[PDB]
Amino acid sequence: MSDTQKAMAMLIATFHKYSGKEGDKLTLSKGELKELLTAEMSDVFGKTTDKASLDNIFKDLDANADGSVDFQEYITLIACITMLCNEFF
Amino acid sequence: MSDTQKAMAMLIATFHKYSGKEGDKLTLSKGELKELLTAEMSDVFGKTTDKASLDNIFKDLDANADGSVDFQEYITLIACITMLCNEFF
Ligand SMILES: [Mg+2]
Ligand SMILES: [Mg+2]
């Protein structure tokens, strides 16, 4: 396993903790993504952060407006929060 | 550091090995991304894989057609290759 493969395995495992592992297509609901962000990005998000901030982030991620985000959307968010994307501006 | 933060740090470090660390905006050229994929995803890509396959992947990732991909585009690719995205179909 390369470092890249190990890192992806860890990111998938965190996604699995909050999503299902038994669903046909693994997705996070809005409340599940909020719990994930506050627990895993606790120095950028906290349970003190505005719930409106988290809600607006989810609405922009949930492009199809079904109330769920998939793994690809989730990791795009994490990568953008970490290496602060200029697309945010 | 959470598991998610550690995994992102590792993915950023791999990106840095092939991109610059001194450029204003860190990007990978086409040849740099190809080297990264063959070294870090060696059971999905190999130096035996068609160079045309890698070239078509880069052209679809390089959305602005400038010959470079950024970190967000790169990680979208890695996440799609790992958890095989149905968007590929
Ligand atoms: Mg959705
Ligand atoms: Mg480009």
mmCIF file with all atom_site columns, C-alpha atoms and ligand atoms in Angstrom:
data_model
loop_
_atom_site.group_PDB
_atom_site.id
_atom_site.type_symbol
_atom_site.label_atom_id
_atom_site.label_alt_id
_atom_site.label_comp_id
_atom_site.label_asym_id
_atom_site.label_entity_id
_atom_site.label_seq_id
_atom_site.pdbx_PDB_ins_code
_atom_site.Cartn_x
_atom_site.Cartn_y
_atom_site.Cartn_z
_atom_site.occupancy
_atom_site.B_iso_or_equiv
_atom_site.pdbx_formal_charge
_atom_site.auth_seq_id
_atom_site.auth_comp_id
_atom_site.auth_asym_id
_atom_site.auth_atom_id
_atom_site.pdbx_PDB_model_num
ATOM   1   C  CA . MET A 1 1  ? 0.000   0.000  0.000   1.00 0.00 ? 1  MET A CA 1
ATOM   2   C  CA . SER A 1 2  ? 1.352   3.373  -1.051  1.00 0.00 ? 2  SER A CA 1
ATOM   3   C  CA . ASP A 1 3  ? 0.985   6.428  1.174   1.00 0.00 ? 3  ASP A CA 1
ATOM   4   C  CA . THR A 1 4  ? -1.748  7.678  -1.155  1.00 0.00 ? 4  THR A CA 1
ATOM   5   C  CA . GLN A 1 5  ? -3.637  4.383  -0.898  1.00 0.00 ? 5  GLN A CA 1
ATOM   6   C  CA . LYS A 1 6  ? -3.282  4.363  2.894   1.00 0.00 ? 6  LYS A CA 1
ATOM   7   C  CA . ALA A 1 7  ? -4.546  7.932  3.177   1.00 0.00 ? 7  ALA A CA 1
ATOM   8   C  CA . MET A 1 8  ? -7.551  7.145  0.974   1.00 0.00 ? 8  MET A CA 1
ATOM   9   C  CA . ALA A 1 9  ? -8.322  4.063  3.067   1.00 0.00 ? 9  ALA A CA 1
ATOM   10  C  CA . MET A 1 10 ? -8.387  6.256  6.177   1.00 0.00 ? 10 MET A CA 1
ATOM   11  C  CA . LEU A 1 11 ? -10.645 8.854  4.552   1.00 0.00 ? 11 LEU A CA 1
ATOM   12  C  CA . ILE A 1 12 ? -13.025 6.118  3.388   1.00 0.00 ? 12 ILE A CA 1
ATOM   13  C  CA . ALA A 1 13 ? -13.076 4.649  6.906   1.00 0.00 ? 13 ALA A CA 1
ATOM   14  C  CA . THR A 1 14 ? -14.082 8.001  8.427   1.00 0.00 ? 14 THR A CA 1
ATOM   15  C  CA . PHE A 1 15 ? -16.836 8.356  5.823   1.00 0.00 ? 15 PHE A CA 1
ATOM   16  C  CA . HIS A 1 16 ? -18.054 4.859  6.753   1.00 0.00 ? 16 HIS A CA 1
ATOM   17  C  CA . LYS A 1 17 ? -18.310 5.720  10.463  1.00 0.00 ? 17 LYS A CA 1
ATOM   18  C  CA . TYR A 1 18 ? -21.069 8.262  9.755   1.00 0.00 ? 18 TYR A CA 1
ATOM   19  C  CA . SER A 1 19 ? -22.632 6.967  6.534   1.00 0.00 ? 19 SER A CA 1
ATOM   20  C  CA . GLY A 1 20 ? -23.788 3.412  6.116   1.00 0.00 ? 20 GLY A CA 1
ATOM   21  C  CA . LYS A 1 21 ? -21.658 0.421  5.299   1.00 0.00 ? 21 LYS A CA 1
ATOM   22  C  CA . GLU A 1 22 ? -24.677 -1.641 4.195   1.00 0.00 ? 22 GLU A CA 1
ATOM   23  C  CA . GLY A 1 23 ? -26.398 0.779  1.817   1.00 0.00 ? 23 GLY A CA 1
ATOM   24  C  CA . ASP A 1 24 ? -26.196 0.321  -1.933  1.00 0.00 ? 24 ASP A CA 1
ATOM   25  C  CA . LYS A 1 25 ? -24.682 3.803  -2.402  1.00 0.00 ? 25 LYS A CA 1
ATOM   26  C  CA . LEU A 1 26 ? -22.918 5.243  0.633   1.00 0.00 ? 26 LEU A CA 1
ATOM   27  C  CA . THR A 1 27 ? -24.010 8.814  1.351   1.00 0.00 ? 27 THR A CA 1
ATOM   28  C  CA . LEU A 1 28 ? -24.058 11.257 4.249   1.00 0.00 ? 28 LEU A CA 1
ATOM   29  C  CA . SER A 1 29 ? -27.168 13.101 5.305   1.00 0.00 ? 29 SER A CA 1
ATOM   30  C  CA . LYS A 1 30 ? -26.910 16.726 6.386   1.00 0.00 ? 30 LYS A CA 1
ATOM   31  C  CA . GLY A 1 31 ? -26.862 15.874 10.084  1.00 0.00 ? 31 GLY A CA 1
ATOM   32  C  CA . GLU A 1 32 ? -24.293 13.142 9.503   1.00 0.00 ? 32 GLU A CA 1
ATOM   33  C  CA . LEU A 1 33 ? -21.901 15.428 7.634   1.00 0.00 ? 33 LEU A CA 1
ATOM   34  C  CA . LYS A 1 34 ? -22.207 18.029 10.393  1.00 0.00 ? 34 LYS A CA 1
ATOM   35  C  CA . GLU A 1 35 ? -21.258 15.458 13.037  1.00 0.00 ? 35 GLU A CA 1
ATOM   36  C  CA . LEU A 1 36 ? -18.309 14.307 10.911  1.00 0.00 ? 36 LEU A CA 1
ATOM   37  C  CA . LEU A 1 37 ? -16.926 17.813 10.404  1.00 0.00 ? 37 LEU A CA 1
ATOM   38  C  CA . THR A 1 38 ? -17.145 18.799 14.074  1.00 0.00 ? 38 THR A CA 1
ATOM   39  C  CA . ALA A 1 39 ? -15.416 15.576 15.167  1.00 0.00 ? 39 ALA A CA 1
ATOM   40  C  CA . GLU A 1 40 ? -12.751 15.304 12.442  1.00 0.00 ? 40 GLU A CA 1
ATOM   41  C  CA . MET A 1 41 ? -12.012 18.955 11.606  1.00 0.00 ? 41 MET A CA 1
ATOM   42  C  CA . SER A 1 42 ? -12.385 20.189 15.183  1.00 0.00 ? 42 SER A CA 1
ATOM   43  C  CA . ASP A 1 43 ? -9.968  23.132 14.819  1.00 0.00 ? 43 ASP A CA 1
ATOM   44  C  CA . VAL A 1 44 ? -11.793 24.508 11.759  1.00 0.00 ? 44 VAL A CA 1
ATOM   45  C  CA . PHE A 1 45 ? -15.318 23.516 12.843  1.00 0.00 ? 45 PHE A CA 1
ATOM   46  C  CA . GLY A 1 46 ? -16.570 23.202 16.392  1.00 0.00 ? 46 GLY A CA 1
ATOM   47  C  CA . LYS A 1 47 ? -19.901 22.528 18.015  1.00 0.00 ? 47 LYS A CA 1
ATOM   48  C  CA . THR A 1 48 ? -19.773 26.302 18.612  1.00 0.00 ? 48 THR A CA 1
ATOM   49  C  CA . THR A 1 49 ? -19.700 27.105 14.877  1.00 0.00 ? 49 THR A CA 1
ATOM   50  C  CA . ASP A 1 50 ? -22.900 28.579 13.471  1.00 0.00 ? 50 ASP A CA 1
ATOM   51  C  CA . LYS A 1 51 ? -25.305 25.836 12.433  1.00 0.00 ? 51 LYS A CA 1
ATOM   52  C  CA . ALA A 1 52 ? -26.234 28.178 9.577   1.00 0.00 ? 52 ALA A CA 1
ATOM   53  C  CA . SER A 1 53 ? -22.634 28.046 8.345   1.00 0.00 ? 53 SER A CA 1
ATOM   54  C  CA . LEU A 1 54 ? -22.700 24.244 8.244   1.00 0.00 ? 54 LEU A CA 1
ATOM   55  C  CA . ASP A 1 55 ? -26.148 24.255 6.621   1.00 0.00 ? 55 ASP A CA 1
ATOM   56  C  CA . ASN A 1 56 ? -25.018 26.572 3.812   1.00 0.00 ? 56 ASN A CA 1
ATOM   57  C  CA . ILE A 1 57 ? -21.925 24.444 3.181   1.00 0.00 ? 57 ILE A CA 1
ATOM   58  C  CA . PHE A 1 58 ? -24.094 21.331 2.836   1.00 0.00 ? 58 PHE A CA 1
ATOM   59  C  CA . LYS A 1 59 ? -26.546 23.015 0.458   1.00 0.00 ? 59 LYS A CA 1
ATOM   60  C  CA . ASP A 1 60 ? -23.683 24.021 -1.837  1.00 0.00 ? 60 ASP A CA 1
ATOM   61  C  CA . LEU A 1 61 ? -22.169 20.521 -1.692  1.00 0.00 ? 61 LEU A CA 1
ATOM   62  C  CA . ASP A 1 62 ? -25.494 18.697 -2.190  1.00 0.00 ? 62 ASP A CA 1
ATOM   63  C  CA . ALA A 1 63 ? -25.618 19.646 -5.856  1.00 0.00 ? 63 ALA A CA 1
ATOM   64  C  CA . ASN A 1 64 ? -28.628 17.464 -6.720  1.00 0.00 ? 64 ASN A CA 1
ATOM   65  C  CA . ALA A 1 65 ? -30.547 18.789 -3.681  1.00 0.00 ? 65 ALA A CA 1
ATOM   66  C  CA . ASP A 1 66 ? -31.575 15.327 -2.452  1.00 0.00 ? 66 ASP A CA 1
ATOM   67  C  CA . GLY A 1 67 ? -30.336 15.872 1.106   1.00 0.00 ? 67 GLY A CA 1
ATOM   68  C  CA . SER A 1 68 ? -27.284 13.608 0.769   1.00 0.00 ? 68 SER A CA 1
ATOM   69  C  CA . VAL A 1 69 ? -23.656 13.952 -0.308  1.00 0.00 ? 69 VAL A CA 1
ATOM   70  C  CA . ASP A 1 70 ? -21.504 11.131 -1.642  1.00 0.00 ? 70 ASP A CA 1
ATOM   71  C  CA . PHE A 1 71 ? -17.858 10.307 -1.031  1.00 0.00 ? 71 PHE A CA 1
ATOM   72  C  CA . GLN A 1 72 ? -16.573 12.324 -3.985  1.00 0.00 ? 72 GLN A CA 1
ATOM   73  C  CA . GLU A 1 73 ? -18.434 15.454 -2.855  1.00 0.00 ? 73 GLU A CA 1
ATOM   74  C  CA . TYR A 1 74 ? -17.296 14.944 0.737   1.00 0.00 ? 74 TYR A CA 1
ATOM   75  C  CA . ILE A 1 75 ? -13.608 14.663 -0.150  1.00 0.00 ? 75 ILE A CA 1
ATOM   76  C  CA . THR A 1 76 ? -13.839 17.720 -2.409  1.00 0.00 ? 76 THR A CA 1
ATOM   77  C  CA . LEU A 1 77 ? -15.067 19.609 0.661   1.00 0.00 ? 77 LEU A CA 1
ATOM   78  C  CA . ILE A 1 78 ? -12.292 18.281 2.911   1.00 0.00 ? 78 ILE A CA 1
ATOM   79  C  CA . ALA A 1 79 ? -9.619  19.069 0.327   1.00 0.00 ? 79 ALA A CA 1
ATOM   80  C  CA . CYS A 1 80 ? -11.034 22.579 -0.090  1.00 0.00 ? 80 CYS A CA 1
ATOM   81  C  CA . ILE A 1 81 ? -11.135 23.265 3.654   1.00 0.00 ? 81 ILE A CA 1
ATOM   82  C  CA . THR A 1 82 ? -7.575  21.996 4.148   1.00 0.00 ? 82 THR A CA 1
ATOM   83  C  CA . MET A 1 83 ? -5.780  23.647 1.213   1.00 0.00 ? 83 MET A CA 1
ATOM   84  C  CA . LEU A 1 84 ? -8.120  26.657 1.210   1.00 0.00 ? 84 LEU A CA 1
ATOM   85  C  CA . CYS A 1 85 ? -9.572  26.725 -2.314  1.00 0.00 ? 85 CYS A CA 1
ATOM   86  C  CA . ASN A 1 86 ? -9.573  30.060 -4.128  1.00 0.00 ? 86 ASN A CA 1
ATOM   87  C  CA . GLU A 1 87 ? -12.847 28.837 -5.643  1.00 0.00 ? 87 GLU A CA 1
ATOM   88  C  CA . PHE A 1 88 ? -14.318 29.932 -2.303  1.00 0.00 ? 88 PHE A CA 1
ATOM   89  C  CA . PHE A 1 89 ? -13.685 33.446 -3.670  1.00 0.00 ? 89 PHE A CA 1
ATOM   90  C  CA . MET B 1 1  ? -4.610  15.554 14.577  1.00 0.00 ? 1  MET B CA 1
ATOM   91  C  CA . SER B 1 2  ? -7.678  13.565 13.609  1.00 0.00 ? 2  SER B CA 1
ATOM   92  C  CA . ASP B 1 3  ? -7.451  10.622 11.219  1.00 0.00 ? 3  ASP B CA 1
ATOM   93  C  CA . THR B 1 4  ? -8.990  12.816 8.523   1.00 0.00 ? 4  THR B CA 1
ATOM   94  C  CA . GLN B 1 5  ? -6.397  15.542 9.095   1.00 0.00 ? 5  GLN B CA 1
ATOM   95  C  CA . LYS B 1 6  ? -3.566  12.994 9.050   1.00 0.00 ? 6  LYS B CA 1
ATOM   96  C  CA . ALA B 1 7  ? -4.813  11.450 5.814   1.00 0.00 ? 7  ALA B CA 1
ATOM   97  C  CA . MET B 1 8  ? -5.079  14.874 4.169   1.00 0.00 ? 8  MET B CA 1
ATOM   98  C  CA . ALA B 1 9  ? -1.555  15.737 5.315   1.00 0.00 ? 9  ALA B CA 1
ATOM   99  C  CA . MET B 1 10 ? -0.286  12.574 3.620   1.00 0.00 ? 10 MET B CA 1
ATOM   100 C  CA . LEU B 1 11 ? -2.159  13.305 0.387   1.00 0.00 ? 11 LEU B CA 1
ATOM   101 C  CA . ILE B 1 12 ? -0.796  16.861 0.354   1.00 0.00 ? 12 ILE B CA 1
ATOM   102 C  CA . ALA B 1 13 ? 2.730   15.528 0.924   1.00 0.00 ? 13 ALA B CA 1
ATOM   103 C  CA . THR B 1 14 ? 2.471   13.196 -2.085  1.00 0.00 ? 14 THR B CA 1
ATOM   104 C  CA . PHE B 1 15 ? 1.201   16.084 -4.214  1.00 0.00 ? 15 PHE B CA 1
ATOM   105 C  CA . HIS B 1 16 ? 4.195   18.149 -3.055  1.00 0.00 ? 16 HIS B CA 1
ATOM   106 C  CA . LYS B 1 17 ? 6.702   15.474 -4.117  1.00 0.00 ? 17 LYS B CA 1
ATOM   107 C  CA . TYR B 1 18 ? 5.742   15.930 -7.784  1.00 0.00 ? 18 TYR B CA 1
ATOM   108 C  CA . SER B 1 19 ? 4.466   19.515 -7.904  1.00 0.00 ? 19 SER B CA 1
ATOM   109 C  CA . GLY B 1 20 ? 6.424   22.422 -6.541  1.00 0.00 ? 20 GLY B CA 1
ATOM   110 C  CA . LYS B 1 21 ? 6.654   23.511 -2.947  1.00 0.00 ? 21 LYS B CA 1
ATOM   111 C  CA . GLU B 1 22 ? 7.923   26.984 -3.903  1.00 0.00 ? 22 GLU B CA 1
ATOM   112 C  CA . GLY B 1 23 ? 5.379   28.002 -6.542  1.00 0.00 ? 23 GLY B CA 1
ATOM   113 C  CA . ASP B 1 24 ? 2.645   30.501 -5.770  1.00 0.00 ? 24 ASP B CA 1
ATOM   114 C  CA . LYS B 1 25 ? -0.085  27.999 -6.731  1.00 0.00 ? 25 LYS B CA 1
ATOM   115 C  CA . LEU B 1 26 ? 0.902   24.341 -6.530  1.00 0.00 ? 26 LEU B CA 1
ATOM   116 C  CA . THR B 1 27 ? -0.066  22.432 -9.672  1.00 0.00 ? 27 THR B CA 1
ATOM   117 C  CA . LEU B 1 28 ? 0.898   19.249 -11.491 1.00 0.00 ? 28 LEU B CA 1
ATOM   118 C  CA . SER B 1 29 ? 1.798   19.187 -15.148 1.00 0.00 ? 29 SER B CA 1
ATOM   119 C  CA . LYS B 1 30 ? 0.621   16.303 -17.310 1.00 0.00 ? 30 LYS B CA 1
ATOM   120 C  CA . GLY B 1 31 ? 3.926   14.452 -17.064 1.00 0.00 ? 31 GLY B CA 1
ATOM   121 C  CA . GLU B 1 32 ? 4.052   15.012 -13.313 1.00 0.00 ? 32 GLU B CA 1
ATOM   122 C  CA . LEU B 1 33 ? 0.573   13.602 -12.723 1.00 0.00 ? 33 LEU B CA 1
ATOM   123 C  CA . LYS B 1 34 ? 1.434   10.553 -14.829 1.00 0.00 ? 34 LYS B CA 1
ATOM   124 C  CA . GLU B 1 35 ? 4.528   9.866  -12.716 1.00 0.00 ? 35 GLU B CA 1
ATOM   125 C  CA . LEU B 1 36 ? 2.486   10.286 -9.524  1.00 0.00 ? 36 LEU B CA 1
ATOM   126 C  CA . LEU B 1 37 ? -0.242  7.863  -10.598 1.00 0.00 ? 37 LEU B CA 1
ATOM   127 C  CA . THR B 1 38 ? 2.155   5.121  -11.707 1.00 0.00 ? 38 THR B CA 1
ATOM   128 C  CA . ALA B 1 39 ? 4.127   5.362  -8.447  1.00 0.00 ? 39 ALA B CA 1
ATOM   129 C  CA . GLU B 1 40 ? 1.250   5.805  -5.971  1.00 0.00 ? 40 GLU B CA 1
ATOM   130 C  CA . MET B 1 41 ? -1.590  3.847  -7.606  1.00 0.00 ? 41 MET B CA 1
ATOM   131 C  CA . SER B 1 42 ? 0.655   1.105  -8.981  1.00 0.00 ? 42 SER B CA 1
ATOM   132 C  CA . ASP B 1 43 ? -2.015  -1.635 -8.914  1.00 0.00 ? 43 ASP B CA 1
ATOM   133 C  CA . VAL B 1 44 ? -4.498  0.462  -10.921 1.00 0.00 ? 44 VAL B CA 1
ATOM   134 C  CA . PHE B 1 45 ? -1.929  2.224  -13.130 1.00 0.00 ? 45 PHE B CA 1
ATOM   135 C  CA . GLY B 1 46 ? 1.418   0.850  -14.216 1.00 0.00 ? 46 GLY B CA 1
ATOM   136 C  CA . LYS B 1 47 ? 4.169   1.992  -16.521 1.00 0.00 ? 47 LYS B CA 1
ATOM   137 C  CA . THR B 1 48 ? 2.582   -0.607 -18.833 1.00 0.00 ? 48 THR B CA 1
ATOM   138 C  CA . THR B 1 49 ? -0.766  1.230  -18.951 1.00 0.00 ? 49 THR B CA 1
ATOM   139 C  CA . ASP B 1 50 ? -1.550  2.967  -22.231 1.00 0.00 ? 50 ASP B CA 1
ATOM   140 C  CA . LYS B 1 51 ? -0.078  6.462  -22.291 1.00 0.00 ? 51 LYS B CA 1
ATOM   141 C  CA . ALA B 1 52 ? -3.221  7.402  -24.225 1.00 0.00 ? 52 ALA B CA 1
ATOM   142 C  CA . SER B 1 53 ? -5.333  6.335  -21.242 1.00 0.00 ? 53 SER B CA 1
ATOM   143 C  CA . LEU B 1 54 ? -3.368  8.606  -18.907 1.00 0.00 ? 54 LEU B CA 1
ATOM   144 C  CA . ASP B 1 55 ? -3.457  11.447 -21.446 1.00 0.00 ? 55 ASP B CA 1
ATOM   145 C  CA . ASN B 1 56 ? -7.253  11.278 -21.771 1.00 0.00 ? 56 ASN B CA 1
ATOM   146 C  CA . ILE B 1 57 ? -7.664  11.245 -17.987 1.00 0.00 ? 57 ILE B CA 1
ATOM   147 C  CA . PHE B 1 58 ? -5.538  14.393 -17.693 1.00 0.00 ? 58 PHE B CA 1
ATOM   148 C  CA . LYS B 1 59 ? -7.443  16.220 -20.439 1.00 0.00 ? 59 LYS B CA 1
ATOM   149 C  CA . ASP B 1 60 ? -10.733 15.558 -18.646 1.00 0.00 ? 60 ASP B CA 1
ATOM   150 C  CA . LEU B 1 61 ? -9.276  16.664 -15.296 1.00 0.00 ? 61 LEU B CA 1
ATOM   151 C  CA . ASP B 1 62 ? -7.559  19.785 -16.691 1.00 0.00 ? 62 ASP B CA 1
ATOM   152 C  CA . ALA B 1 63 ? -10.865 21.600 -17.059 1.00 0.00 ? 63 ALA B CA 1
ATOM   153 C  CA . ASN B 1 64 ? -9.349  24.987 -17.953 1.00 0.00 ? 64 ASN B CA 1
ATOM   154 C  CA . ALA B 1 65 ? -7.044  23.350 -20.537 1.00 0.00 ? 65 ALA B CA 1
ATOM   155 C  CA . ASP B 1 66 ? -3.900  25.107 -19.277 1.00 0.00 ? 66 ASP B CA 1
ATOM   156 C  CA . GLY B 1 67 ? -1.853  21.913 -18.969 1.00 0.00 ? 67 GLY B CA 1
ATOM   157 C  CA . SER B 1 68 ? -1.951  21.795 -15.157 1.00 0.00 ? 68 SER B CA 1
ATOM   158 C  CA . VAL B 1 69 ? -4.204  20.344 -12.465 1.00 0.00 ? 69 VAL B CA 1
ATOM   159 C  CA . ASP B 1 70 ? -4.473  21.647 -8.915  1.00 0.00 ? 70 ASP B CA 1
ATOM   160 C  CA . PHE B 1 71 ? -4.803  19.798 -5.625  1.00 0.00 ? 71 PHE B CA 1
ATOM   161 C  CA . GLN B 1 72 ? -8.604  19.809 -5.631  1.00 0.00 ? 72 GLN B CA 1
ATOM   162 C  CA . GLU B 1 73 ? -8.757  18.302 -9.130  1.00 0.00 ? 73 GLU B CA 1
ATOM   163 C  CA . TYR B 1 74 ? -6.088  15.743 -8.243  1.00 0.00 ? 74 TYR B CA 1
ATOM   164 C  CA . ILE B 1 75 ? -7.883  14.498 -5.130  1.00 0.00 ? 75 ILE B CA 1
ATOM   165 C  CA . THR B 1 76 ? -11.181 14.286 -7.022  1.00 0.00 ? 76 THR B CA 1
ATOM   166 C  CA . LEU B 1 77 ? -9.386  11.940 -9.424  1.00 0.00 ? 77 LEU B CA 1
ATOM   167 C  CA . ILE B 1 78 ? -7.880  9.818  -6.640  1.00 0.00 ? 78 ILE B CA 1
ATOM   168 C  CA . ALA B 1 79 ? -11.214 9.562  -4.833  1.00 0.00 ? 79 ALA B CA 1
ATOM   169 C  CA . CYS B 1 80 ? -12.920 8.568  -8.087  1.00 0.00 ? 80 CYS B CA 1
ATOM   170 C  CA . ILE B 1 81 ? -10.347 5.889  -8.923  1.00 0.00 ? 81 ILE B CA 1
ATOM   171 C  CA . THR B 1 82 ? -10.502 4.413  -5.413  1.00 0.00 ? 82 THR B CA 1
ATOM   172 C  CA . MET B 1 83 ? -14.268 4.350  -4.795  1.00 0.00 ? 83 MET B CA 1
ATOM   173 C  CA . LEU B 1 84 ? -15.072 3.876  -8.491  1.00 0.00 ? 84 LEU B CA 1
ATOM   174 C  CA . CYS B 1 85 ? -17.347 6.812  -9.351  1.00 0.00 ? 85 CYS B CA 1
ATOM   175 C  CA . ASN B 1 86 ? -20.526 6.040  -11.277 1.00 0.00 ? 86 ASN B CA 1
ATOM   176 C  CA . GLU B 1 87 ? -19.935 9.427  -12.919 1.00 0.00 ? 87 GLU B CA 1
ATOM   177 C  CA . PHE B 1 88 ? -17.426 7.494  -15.037 1.00 0.00 ? 88 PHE B CA 1
ATOM   178 C  CA . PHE B 1 89 ? -20.570 6.004  -16.624 1.00 0.00 ? 89 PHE B CA 1
HETATM 179 MG MG . MG  C 2 .  ? -27.022 15.011 -2.932  1.00 0.00 ? 1  MG  C MG 1
HETATM 180 MG MG . MG  C 2 .  ? -5.656  23.168 -15.507 1.00 0.00 ? 2  MG  C MG 1
#
